[PDB]
Amino acid sequence: LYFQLEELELDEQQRKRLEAFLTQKQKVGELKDDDFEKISELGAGNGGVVFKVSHKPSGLVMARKLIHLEIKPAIRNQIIRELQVLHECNSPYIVGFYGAFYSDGEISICMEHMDGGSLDQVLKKAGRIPEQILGKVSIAVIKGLTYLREKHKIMHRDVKPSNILVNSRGEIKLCDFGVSGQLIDSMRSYMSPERLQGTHYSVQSDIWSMGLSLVEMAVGRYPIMAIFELLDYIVNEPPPKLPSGVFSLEFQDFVNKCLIKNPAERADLKQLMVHAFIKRSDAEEVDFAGWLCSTIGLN
């Protein structure tokens, strides 16, 4: 394989992992419904269901997301075309992609299977996620958002613990980002106050979503009940804060900068990458893989 990955930073460990995924992907061509065997259900959301599947032609295990959409065939085909951009999204911080296709009322998005599942699933078992682990998560989320914005001009639009996947090799990756404008049009809140009120999507809204997700994972509960009451709280009341004493001053300041109500005052990705919480977390030696495997009983 003639790898053209010099544009990415990539330490030797990241380089080996990404080249291994891309090498395995070469066994995968055209994806069809009849070529899959369902193993088990990984999870489900409001929009779709995700199954752990065996792709019989390649022998690969993958995560197949099925989204029910029975619309005009021409615009369903525009969605499928837009999803093909996922073949160009190669980053240590973005879930690997095998392909996307339509069959009998369902759009299938086939991904790299992440054996640690999502952070909302690990939060259920952990109770609370330690601050040092959240430092590594924050670096991965910032780096993933920077990659999508810089290389592909795409905003995530759905940052939350269920969209941050982890694995037994200690990798942390984003999934379910808004690669398809047409799929967005055809389809607890983590939405920013400005997005709830009606404001054009900005990178700043993803930063708010990350801030709120970090607070939830740190305290072990959604930090903000009726639907109007909850949204009114987000829009019209001060943002939540981490409890003092139990968390470092750097982590408190980091989440506070993500959760500033005014998006122009709220930190941007460049500012977050050089914040004391990130500089401290990047220097820390944390065995994320060991912590993950022990917390959820993975090997």
Ligand X SMILES: Nc1ncnc2c1ncn2[C@@H]1O[C@H](COP(=O)(O)OP(=O)(O)NP(=O)(O)O)[C@@H](O)[C@H]1O
Ligand Y SMILES: COc1ccc(NC(=O)C[C@@H]2SCCNC2=O)cc1
Give me the residues that bind ligand X (CB under 6 A), please: 42-45, 47-48, 50, 63, 95, 111-114, 117-118, 120-121, 158, 162-163, 165, 175-176
Return all residues near 28 (Cβ < 8 A) that are at least 6 apart. Answer: 55, 57, 58, 60, 98, 99
- 3-state class of 42 per DSSP? strand
Q: Which residues pair with 65 in a beta bridge?
A: 50, 109
> Which CB atom, from 163 or from 205, has the smaller least distance to Mg ion?
163
Closest CA to 79 of 163, 178, 149: 178
Q: CA torsion sign, 265 to 270 to 271 to 273?
A: positive
DSSP H or E run through 109: strand 106-112
Q: Tell me, by CB under 6 A, how many residues bind ligand Y.
A: 17
Question: How many CB atoms sit inside 10 A of residue 35's CB?
Answer: 15
Tell whether residue 143 is among the known ligand binding residues: no
Q: State the minimum distance, in angstroms, from the CB of residue 51 to ligand X.
A: 9
Identify what 44 binds: ligand X, ligand Y, Mg ion, none; CB under 5 to 8 Å per kind: ligand X
DSSP for 250-261 reads HHHHHHHHHS-S
Applying CB under 6 A, does 86 fall inside the site for ligand Y? Answer: yes
Applying CB under 6 A, does 215 fall inside the site for ligand Y? Answer: no
Applying CB under 5 A, does 163 fall inside the site for Mg ion? Answer: yes
Applying CB under 6 A, does 177 fall inside the site for ligand Y? Answer: yes
Could you list the active site residues? 158
Q: State the minimum distance, in angstroms, from the CB of residue 187 to ligand X.
A: 8
Contacts to Mg ion by CB under 5 A: 162-163, 176
Contacts to ligand Y by CB under 6 A: 47-48, 65, 67, 86, 95, 97, 109, 111, 158, 175-180, 183
